[PDB]
Amino acid sequence: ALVIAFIGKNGAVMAGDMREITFEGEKPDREKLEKELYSGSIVTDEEMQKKAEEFGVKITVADCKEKVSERNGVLVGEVSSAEGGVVKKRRLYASAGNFAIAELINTEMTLTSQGKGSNFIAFGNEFTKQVANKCFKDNWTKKSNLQDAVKILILCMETVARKTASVSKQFMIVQTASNADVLKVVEKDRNC
Amino acid sequence: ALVIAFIGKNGAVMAGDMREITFEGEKPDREKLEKELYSGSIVTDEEMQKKAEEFGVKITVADCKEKVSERNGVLVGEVSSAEGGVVKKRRLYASAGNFAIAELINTEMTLTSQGKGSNFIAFGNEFTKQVANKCFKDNWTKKSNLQDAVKILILCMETVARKTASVSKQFMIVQTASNADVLKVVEKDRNC
């Protein structure tokens, strides 16, 4: 689906949809259907289920996976793009000026990026990630601090609330005052 | 593994170990090994791994699954006794005087018990559940309110901290003042 964060001197903003989707049926079919939703081709949920009995899939939903959490002045988000055997997670930590992104298999944690400074990020299905990328330039100028960007995230969250079905229509957003050096959280998660 | 709660007029106490265990290898073997740990036959973790290369299993661990949580004056605990395809959860809600236990498959939530009044409960592997049952009578008299029982849980938590390896040596305990009518939490989880 999608979740997004922004990092700067003032603060950090992380917004995430709460939708998780369960796929049951011919696994070759599942990757045949999965294509179409990821590619972004439908939005209405009635136009979602339509196709499903065309291909053979039963698809339980609940728009309340808590895709971001606020552990201690750092905001954590995470996409469970599971696909089959077990677990395929993919998580971020952010604060004011500090930021990193990690890829999880099951228990195992693998990093992919870090550092300090200023950034805008998202994770998703290919399409959802693209639509956030549209909107962030849309409404973003360096002539903002946090405060505008916080609204930006909502429009973008609406924008793909609007134009898609892989993303829970309810969504949750959290903020930090703190330049917490997010680096530690990852080591604690690894000992865990 | 194990987690335990006590319910009375004053309050509720829920204590849970944080250990989750990952099983990799010949699935027929896994149920062959799983027997022995559940039955309770080992405690030291070096005497844990020993047997594993005897049978062919790689077993990643982390003693920090958050087996209980405090959502709003009600304490929730949950054993993920997964065994294979997907998810086999099993959860409780408790407060001061009110209590219920639900069985989860994946998304789906099934109840098994409810009501109001006074109780002592646990979930686990067969052995761990038994050892808590020992200890609760050990140190329990109706001539207690909460306050003793809160310590009881620790000894029992130590007692199977002690005498077993399926249970994380670190553990977490939470308490409520409130006779919150735990009933609505199950319905909220179902809409979710």
Residue numbers in the entry:
A (entry chain B), B (entry chain A): 1 to 192
Paper text:
The discovery of peptide ligase activity in the Connectase family of enzymes (CETs) from archaea has expanded protease repurposing strategies. However, original CETs exhibit significant residual protease activity, leading to nonprocessive (reversible) ligation and limiting their application. In this study, we present crystal structures of a highly active protein ligase from Methanococcus maripaludis (MmCET) in both its apo- and substrate-bound forms. By determining the crystal structure of MmCET, both with and without a preferred peptide substrate at its catalytic transition state, we uncovered the essential elements responsible for the high-precision substrate recognition of N-terminal motifs.
To this end, we first attempted to capture MmCET in both its apo form and its peptide substrate-bound form. In this conformation, cysteines in MmCET form a stable intermolecular disulfide bond (C65–C193), locking the enzyme in a dimeric state and constraining the crystal lattice. Interestingly, removing these cysteines via site-directed mutagenesis did not affect the crystallization, and ligand-free enzymes were still observed in the same crystal form. Moreover, volume analysis of the substrate pocket of the free MmCET structure revealed significant potential for designing more favorable peptide substrates.
